[model samples]
Target: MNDRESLIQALHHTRDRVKDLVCSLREDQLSVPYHPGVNPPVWEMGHSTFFYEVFVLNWLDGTPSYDPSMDDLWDSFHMDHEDRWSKTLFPSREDTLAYMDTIIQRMEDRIRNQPLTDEALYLYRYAIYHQNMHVESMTWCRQTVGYPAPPFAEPKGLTGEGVDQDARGDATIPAGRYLIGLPANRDSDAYATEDFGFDNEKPAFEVDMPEFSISRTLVTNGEFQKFVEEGGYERPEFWSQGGRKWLEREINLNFGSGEPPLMGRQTHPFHWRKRDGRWYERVFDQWLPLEPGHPVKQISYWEAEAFCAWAGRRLPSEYEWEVAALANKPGEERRRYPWGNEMDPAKLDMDQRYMGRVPVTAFPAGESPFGCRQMLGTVWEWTGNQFMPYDGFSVDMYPFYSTLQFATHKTTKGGGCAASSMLIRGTYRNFYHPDRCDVYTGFRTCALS
Candidate 1:
């Protein structure tokens, strides 16, 4: 039930998470060095506050902002990252968070006491989800800067129930007409906020998917390690023209001042290492032996493509991936997640615990209808197609949400362990540039046939 209470809980939850992510760091850690795509925590939290003011509070009743001076500073689109990163330009962490606190009190009072129209509820839910998205970003910011993980609930242990020892092989999906997107949303009272999908996820269309087989589990570290060991990086045959160029850029960026490592050097998945001929992956601030059973994560789209090429497999088309995720036995209604309708942290590896990825064989109940394991969460899975709009796409209230990224980003599905379970579902489409390995991403392969 995504009622008003649920909405309030979500709003409070994300705001608390924002505080947890920033409150533990030293005063100096508030403004991090220029990491390419992330914002300083001081500015990032303030931006989340401004989002509510502009979208829900201001738009709902036309209230004057708390501080007109902060308008340009907190507006992400209005100001560039260069200015956002300038410590000289931002308010002190105390001031920014205090401003956020002022807004939260106003927002909660309005939502708690007043009867919210469907449109108001829609905006409130949108703002909460927007904050949730930033929470994920802040989580990764800690990882990018080697800061300690934010305080979280106790570590979740493996259930020993997933796909048993190690999940491998493919699940055969039969041919059928499958729906790929959710129906369009309405601002009227009849529509629920849970039905509020992004513009790109709308104008539902059906695809005639042929029988295909997709890897039951994601490509494991051990599985991908074989590709790295076989000189996959140096072999241009495995990389596309674009991928090769990306490799060159990475080499030039990281190794320009020194002699570059020999060709086919395993320089990426970026945090990977080979100390004494043993594979290791850096998890947050600590280096640990690479867990062979864990799905190899933080892989760029190009890296997944190259791995597919070397393995004689291919990435699943978005439509194919969707069918595998939702199509169970015939005559059953479509569900929100791979296993069912609710978010189950016990079975799905999500909720931003920062506990690190577990073996793909861990969450047995997370399997999809066709017996595809870990289709909803664990790691965001890269699909074959570029991010494209549906047949009758129109801009949602958040115009740039899907419109700006159409041709530039690749479509990824599921959510990673660091992602909040409430933010992702089977139909949720996440897009990122082909070269971004910073986000928790990995891939499973489909047969070339």
Candidate 2:
């Protein structure tokens, strides 16, 4: 598809996905309690609309906003955390959806009729990809608020065929001079509108990596459960100074039951419960017996660190993770995905196909060149590195994208179940607070070298 064809398709797909995620919620559910990780769905509708008006429509025709009052009300950068819940600050559900419809029609019209300059095309793609990200957040919002799973997937009970066997072992990766990010020269017009990259991934640099062995699969629930059963949380040597501080703080786990599950340090994953001596995990409103074959999801980096320590393994540095993921074989050019350039969903578990994580060994076709498996999906893997920028980093149109999280956030790679395939690339860097585990996340380990 040409840029224009891809842009139009992307816009429509994202809008439909956003509606499917939030349109079914009851009126009261639209305004949720304040959670730092999520925004009220009603506010999110308006905020997504505002993105197009500010970036795409206005960029095309220099048109003024539909309402001047929206700038302060809908701009996410200017808004406060708790203000998203205000009935006065946000429009009603009907009005918000209607306004979104209007802006979306205008956006489609621009893409259908107008000539897309290189810059205009970039802005449109940016808007579509931006909305794609919000769709993921909207899915997680249901998980956060104790709502049922999104309308897309089948019930978790009938889910037993493909995701219930453990993947064991590791891959020996022989290291060489591997490129860690995008090339230095592609930071120009030709790169911006394509399946390009964020500023943090630009100016690709090479690293002289030592030979290492990374896990062939993510750490399974059964593997992590052994650690928990053996008192993984109680062991002081497994945790760092920062991790110790996190354990002592009050943690309000607002998942299936809004009740605070662990006020202080907890023993296991947040949604997990010990019922009748069997481990059960909450999937939205339902609880099922925990599948030991499935990879562990939604644990903080610190939790991953502890598990690695207990297992006599260590988290891979961002460089090492990238080396294992990107193909460094002889006579091979770099590819965006672990398998290849095309994003085949059949290769991995992503794009919200199901709430439950598939087994790490399930997608044999998705393995990296060095035999590392499930590198692109299932769950975001925590790396033992800070979320820093590549050498000669420069901002894209989204100026504050990497700047806000640098140094403060820990780097994670490979987008999770809810992540859009259009948004994740091998070079794409995802960062999160080390203590945050609400989102779908897990880790793979490397043998200490």
**Considering every candidate listed, which one attains the maximal lDDT?**
2
Q: Where is model 1 more than 4 Å wrong at Cα?
A: 153-167, 187-190, 250-266, 328-332, 354-356
- The window of 10 residues in a row where model 1 has the poorest summed lDDT is 250-259
Clashes of each: 1, 0
lDDT string for model 2 (304-373, tens) is 8888888899999888888889764434676888897787767877878865457667778887887788
Candidate 2: residue 61 Cα off by (Å): 2.2
Model 2 TM-score, all chains together: 0.94
Model 1 lDDT vs. the true structure? 0.77
Cα error, residue 195 of model 2, in Å, equals 6.1
lDDT of each: 0.77, 0.79
**TM, every model:** 0.92, 0.94
> What's the lDDT for residue 440 in model 1?
82
